[PDB]
Structures are given as C-alpha cells and as structure tokens.
C-alpha cells in the first residue's frame, strides 16, 4: 500500500520522530562532552561510535522532517523515489558501520586480554583513527549492492520511511547473516573476556591470601619468643611465599627475582633458628619485611587497579552488546521468516522500529554508565 500511496496519511503522529531526534542529539552531545572531559583505544573507539551514530541521526532525521513538512511520502517528495533509496541506504549503512565498530571494540578487548604481549607493544592512536575510515568503506561497499540491479528497496512504511526489499533479492538474507555472525562473534569475545577476568580474579585472590598469610606469619615471628614457634612460623611463611610465585613481562623478571630473594632470606632465618639465634632471626624477619616493602607491595597495587579498569570496560561493552542484541535480533528473525507471513503478522515494521531506537539507545546508555560505577564492580 505504501508503494501506491503518495500522500501523508491523515492523523499520523509526527511527535515520535522529533522526540527521537532530540533525544539522539542530546545523548550524542552528552557522550561527546563526557569523552572530551577525559586516551585509550577503547575510549577512541567509543568516541568514533558516538560520532557515527550522530552522523547517522543528522542524516536520517532531516529526511523524515521534510516528509512531514511537505505532507508527502519519500516517493512523492523526491523524483523516482530517490530518497526512498538514499534514506534506506543510510538506514542500512550506519546500521552496519556502528555494528562493525562494536565488533572492533570486542576484538580490542580480546587483543587486550587474549594476547597480552601483543597489546603491550606500541599501539599508536593512528591505528584507531584509521579503523574508522576502513569500517566506513567496508560498510559502504557492502551496502552498495542495491541500486545496481542486485538488490531493490521497497516501502514498508506507516507513511514515512523505506527499507530493503524481501523477495528474489538475496541482499537482505546476506545482511541478516552478517549481522548474526557479528553478534555471535561479539558474544564469544565477551564470554572469553569474562572467563579470563574470572581467572584473573581467582589468581589475584590467591595472591592476596598468600600475602595475608605472609603478614600473619611475620606477626607471629615478631610476637613469638620460643624457638619451636619461630621455626614453625618461618616454615609456614616459606610455604606461603612458595605458594605465591606460582602465578614474560620485564617487571615479571624482577617480581619473581624478588620472591627468590625473599625465600632465600627465609632460609637464612631458618639456619639461624637451627643455630639457636632468636633475636638475630627476628632481625632477619625485619629484613624480610623491608624486602616486601621494596619489591612486592607495588605489584599487588598495580594488579588491583588494572583489573578494576578492565572489569569496568568489560561491563560497559557487555551492556552495549545487550542493547545491540535487543536491536538486531528482531530484524534477523524477520529476515528468515516467509515474506507472506512477515506481512501477515506485520512483524517487519516492528523490527525496523527497533533498529531505529538503536540509534537512541546506543549513546544514552554510556551517559548511564558514569565513572561512579564501582557499585556494579561490586557485583
């Protein structure tokens, strides 16, 4: 009916488009301001994603506004439904590009955790800045299949917009398959990062327990006076020290060496105990503490903050992914269904609407996840 209709249906509510445009613009501006207040590669990718969403909104909304201003559909206001193609192209173009950006971020997280030494090397900002034009070109080349007799655009509308044709053209199925593959890849990367972060948390908890045992044994040595208790506490401290070095960075070449120095001193103290020197042994323990303050305290602090930031970013990404799923799963499901039925149940429209609200939901969630996010890190 949209293909034959060339006039705006009376009684259609035009406030929805204006509200969505205003909300998207406000969210994009807030996200850009918050990012300008702060760079890491993930933040640059988020900034590029917000900029892409802003460009998509600023290219999509004026067409819908002119459609209401002229009281005519896209086929009527523009000759040979040119806008009905162009708009649709835009409605697909960013819909892929931003999606790809998401994958990139996920891949970054993988390259952040899956390959630590690969990420430790110098990764200049030029790479992140060059990722955006490459993603744009790939998305344009992929969405350039229509208008070349390979794919067609029809009007699945309530009176304002156009989209891809479902039928003999196989571009819609390929686009849905690409979206599903990207979603599966992002989910797999997120689960891998989840498992790696759980392993890191377990290792950090084990190291903290070993450090607490070392401190307790040192306090016992300082408070004890009998040779048997001092020897038992020294044995427990040596066991706890050997149970901590079990977890090839340059700093990792000193930390391990620092433990070797510690254990060695512990052995010395044990020798003193076998010689019957109590006070001397205590002095040795003091030296132990000094070594701890010299070499081990720093590593633990670095491990804590790093992991923290990691988890933060992770949760961010995860939320984003959830959003993307809620926005693209309806569309992929429609693509696989039979066109007849797809119209009979009027499912396609809904999916499209979801896609649209995607441009609203992508930036705002960022402003939702403020730096005071430690509560969520508590889990």
């Amino acid at each position, epitope marked *: 009916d949209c293909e034959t209709r060339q006039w705006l249906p009376p009684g259609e509510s035009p406030a929805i488009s204006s509200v969505m445009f205003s909300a998207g613009v406000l969210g994009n501006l807030i996200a850009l301001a918050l990012l300008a207040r702060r760079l890491s590669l993930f933040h640059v990718l988020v900034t590029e994603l917000v900029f892409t969403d802003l460009l998509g909104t600023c290219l999509i909304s004026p067409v819908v506004l002119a459609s209401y201003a002229r009281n005519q559909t896209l086929v009527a206001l523009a000759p040979e439904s040119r806008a009905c193609t162009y708009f649709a192209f835009a409605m697909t173009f960013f819909s892929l590009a931003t999606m790809l950006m998401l994958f990139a971020m996920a891949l970054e997280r993988y390259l952040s955790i899956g390959h630590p030494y690969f990420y430790q090397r110098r990764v200049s900002r030029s790479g992140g800045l060059a990722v955006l034009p490459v993603i744009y070109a790939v998305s344009l080349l992929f969405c350039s299949l229509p208008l070349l007799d390979y794919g067609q655009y029809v009007q699945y509308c309530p009176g304002t917009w156009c989209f891809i044709r479902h039928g003999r053209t196989a571009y819609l199925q390929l686009y849905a398959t690409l979206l599903l593959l990207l979603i599966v890849s992002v989910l797999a990367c997120n689960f891998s990062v989840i498992l790696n972060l759980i392993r890191a948390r377990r290792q950090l908890a084990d190291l903290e327990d070993n450090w607490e045992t070392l401190n307790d044994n040192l306090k016992v040595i300082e408070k004890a006076d009998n040779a048997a208790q001092v020897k038992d506490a020294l044995t427990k401290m040596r*066991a*706890a020290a050997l149970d901590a070095q079990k977890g090839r960075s340059p700093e990792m070449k000193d930390f391990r060496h620092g433990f*070797d120095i510690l254990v*060695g001193q512990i052995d010395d103290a044990l020798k003193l105990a076998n010689e019957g020197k109590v006070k001397e042994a205590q002095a040795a323990a003091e030296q132990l503490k000094t070594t701890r303050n010299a070499y081990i305290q720093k590593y633990l602090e670095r491990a804590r903050s790093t992991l923290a930031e990691e988890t933060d970013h992770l949760i961010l990404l995860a939320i984003m992914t959830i959003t993307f799923a809620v926005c693209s799963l309806p569309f992929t499901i429609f693509a696989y269904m039979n066109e007849t039925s797809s119209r009979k149940e009027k499912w396609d429209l809904q999916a499209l609407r979801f896609l649209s609200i995607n441009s609203i939901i992508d930036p705002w969630v960022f402003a939702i996840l403020r730096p005071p996010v430690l509560r969520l890190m508590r889990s």
Partner: antibody, heavy 124, light 109 residues
Framework: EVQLVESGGGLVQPGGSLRLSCAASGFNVRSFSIHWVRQAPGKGLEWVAYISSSSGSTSYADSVKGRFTISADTSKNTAYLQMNSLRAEDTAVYYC?????????????????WGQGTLVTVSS | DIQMTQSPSSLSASVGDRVTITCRASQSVSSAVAWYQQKPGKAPKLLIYSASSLYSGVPSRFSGSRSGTDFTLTISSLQPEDFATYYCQQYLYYSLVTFGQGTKVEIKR
C-alpha cells in the same frame, strides 16, 4: 656422569662408632648440599642428616640429635658421617644424595641421583 | 613437623590399567612434593619433581597433579618394568624431609 658411592658400612657392636663415607663423581660438593637417607628392612625411607658445604651448616633428625656428626671435605670432595653410641634400631641401609641450593631449578629437582647405599647392622 | 600421609598402601593391577596414588601433607606445601620409585634390591629413582614436570629420563607414562593439599600420581599404562615400590616425599626445606608409608604395586591374577 653424576655418581655417589657409599662405603664404610657393615657390622658394629652396640655402643661403638662407625664412619661412613660418601664419594661424589661428576660434580663438586661445594655446589650441592649432601643428604643422607636411612631405610629400615621392611619399612620406608627416612632422612637422617644434611650438610651444606657452601655455608657450613648441618642438620640432623630429631631422633638422632646428639649421636651423629656429619662433615664434608672439599679437598677430597666427599662426605663423612660419624656415628657414636649406636643402638639396635640402627640396622638399616644408608643412601647418599645431593640436593641443589635454592636459587632456581637445582633446588626443585630434589634427590635426582641416589647412591647405591651401604648396610649397617648393630647387634651384639 | 610435616607428616606425609599416603593412603594407598597395597594395590594390584595388570598391564594397560590406570593406577592412581594419593599423597596428603599435614601442612600446606605449594609444590615441594616428589614421587620416587624403588625396586627390590635397588636404589630409588626420582620420577616426578615439583608435581608438574617430568624427570629427564623417566617414561611419560607417569604424571602428577595437585588439588588443594592432595597430590596425585597417575600411571596410564602399567608395564613389567614399572612394578616397584612408590614413595611420596616432601622437600619444603633442607631440614624438613619426611617420607610417606610406601606403596608397592602388585600383579593381579
């Protein structure tokens, strides 16, 4: 290759003294601590004495404190264990071994080479 | 005063069978647990050091594992040359060396 030969074992009357010798071949005793293990007939292994020729510290088992004396000679590259005031429980087999010093891998490989060991029998 | 407790004391099996030996320590030891194989009328020989790696020379049929404070020696396939007594030892310190109670595999019939 790395070999440890024990000698000096045999029959000793109760209350006497016996000198056991452990000779190493293939390495220097100043780079590895020398340990002695005792095994009773129909039983398991048991550490009895240890010496570290790098620093000069010695250690013994709680049951043998005050009766055994271990020493090491770097000029001859060997170890000597003197046993005084023996008892009937000292009928066993002694083995000599080397355990590396702490820094690094040699320490982790504990008792990588075991000697042939010698039999000691204390009976009147 | 670590006292190693070895639960398996007598087990009988044939060639090709899997053998599992468990060693428990009275005190928490990180990795200072080793397994030794002593033949009747012969000197013992180190099989597994640090409970993770394998000794240079011993066959790959023996493996070691750790779970909390319990160490596990696993033999995938028995052979007529692997029928000897097994001992668990702790080497946390030079003066702290305590052996287990022993474990001698037998031929079942």
């Amino acid at each position: 290759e790395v070999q440890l030969v024990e000698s000096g074992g045999g029959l000793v009357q109760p209350g006497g003294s016996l000198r056991l010798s452990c000779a190493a071949s293939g390495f220097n005793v100043r780079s590895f601590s020398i340990h002695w293990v005792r095994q009773a007939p129909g039983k398991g292994l048991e550490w009895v004495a240890y010496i570290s020729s790098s620093s000069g510290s010695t250690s013994y088992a709680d049951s043998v404190k005050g009766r055994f004396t271990i020493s090491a000679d770097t000029s001859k590259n060997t170890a000597y264990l003197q046993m005084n005031s023996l008892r009937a429980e000292d009928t066993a087999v002694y083995y000599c071994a080397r355990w590396g010093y702490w820094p690094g891998e040699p320490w982790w490989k504990a008792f990588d080479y075991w000697g042939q060991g010698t039999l000691v029998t204390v009976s009147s | 005063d670590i006292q190693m407790t070895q639960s398996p004391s007598s087990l009988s099996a044939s060639v090709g069978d899997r053998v599992t030996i468990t060693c428990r320590a009275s005190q928490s030891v990180s990795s200072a647990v080793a397994w030794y194989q002593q033949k009747p009328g012969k000197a013992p020989k180190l099989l597994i050091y640090s409970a993770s790696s394998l000794y240079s020379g011993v066959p790959s049929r023996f493996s070691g594992s750790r779970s909390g404070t319990d160490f596990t020696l696993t033999i995938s396939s028995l052979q007529p040359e692997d029928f000897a007594t097994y001992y668990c030892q702790q080497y946390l310190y030079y003066s702290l060396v305590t052996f287990g109670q022993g474990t001698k595999v037998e031929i079942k019939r």
